[PDB]
């Protein structure tokens, strides 16, 4: 769960 890492 990272608030600064987008999916993909």
């Amino acid at each position: 769960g990272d608030g600064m890492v987008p999916p993909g």
Partner: antibody, heavy 116, light 112 residues
Framework: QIQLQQSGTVLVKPASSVKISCKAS????????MHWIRQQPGQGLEWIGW????????KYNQKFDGKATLTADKSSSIAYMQLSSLTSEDSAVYFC?????????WGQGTLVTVCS | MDIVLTQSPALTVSLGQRATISCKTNQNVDYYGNSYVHWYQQKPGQKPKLLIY???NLASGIPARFSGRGSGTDFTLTIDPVEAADTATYYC?????????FGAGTKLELKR
């Protein structure tokens, strides 16, 4: 208790370059990315880019390409950002952030002031 | 295609009433039942602090008077009641696509 203690205040002359550090403790340094944030005086927050300490992989904001280079020493659990060709637009406070399970741990911030 | 987050610069609320921060995205940030907007609070001279993640989720050790809601392009952060501690600058940030982008920030102040 994850903590990130950052480099102290630096004051530099224009067109030089500086390196600041984010010392990570309390989590597996290579397990989570280290992001970097820039805040200009009186301005909002900008995401510079991230590094994965495990392999040294880096991803960047397009705006900071050629301005910031991210490095990591898993030996010392320290993250590094170098800002090169400093101008007055680069006078700012720079934060390092790492995330664990939707909790964000922020460094106290490093004040970079470039003289004009 | 950098995502633009629009949020008003200032909010002046009276002590103890509801305050509502708004964040508007130029692009849809929802991805598989979750929306990638996060909220921070930054007091003067302090580092930013996470309040809400994924639009609606309270962060650890964050008081219950904070709450976030919203979907698609429209999101709000709600402080009810507003306390004397809460004067600060509040940011929305999107993590749907790189680069991660923040709103300009809403300074919250108290009516006198």
């Amino acid at each position: 208790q994850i903590q990130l203690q950052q480099s102290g205040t630096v004051l530099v002359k224009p067109a030089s370059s500086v390196k600041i550090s984010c010392k990570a403790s309390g989590y597996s340094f290579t397990s989570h990315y280290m992001h970097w944030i820039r805040q200009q005086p009186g301005q909002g927050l900008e995401w510079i880019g991230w590094i994965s300490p495990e392999q040294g992989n880096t991803k960047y904001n397009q705006k900071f390409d050629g301005k910031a280079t991210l490095t990591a020493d898993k030996s010392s659990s320290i993250a590094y950002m170098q800002l090169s060709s400093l101008t007055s637009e680069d006078s700012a406070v720079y934060f390092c952030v790492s995330w664990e399970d939707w909790s964000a741990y922020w460094g106290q911030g490093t004040l970079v002031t470039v003289c004009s | 295609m950098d995502i633009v987050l629009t949020q008003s610069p200032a909010l002046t609320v009276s002590l103890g009433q509801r305050a509502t921060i708004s964040c508007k995205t130029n692009q849809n940030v929802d991805y598989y039942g979750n929306s990638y907007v996060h909220w921070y609070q930054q007091k003067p001279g302090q580092k930013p602090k996470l309040l809400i993640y994924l639009a609606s989720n309270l962060a650890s050790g964050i008081p219950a008077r904070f709450s976030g809601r919203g979907s698609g392009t429209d999101f709000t952060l709600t402080i009810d009641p507003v306390e004397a501690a809460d004067t600060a600058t509040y940011y929305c940030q999107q993590s749907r696509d790189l680069p991660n982008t923040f709103g300009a920030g809403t300074k919250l102040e108290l009516k006198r």
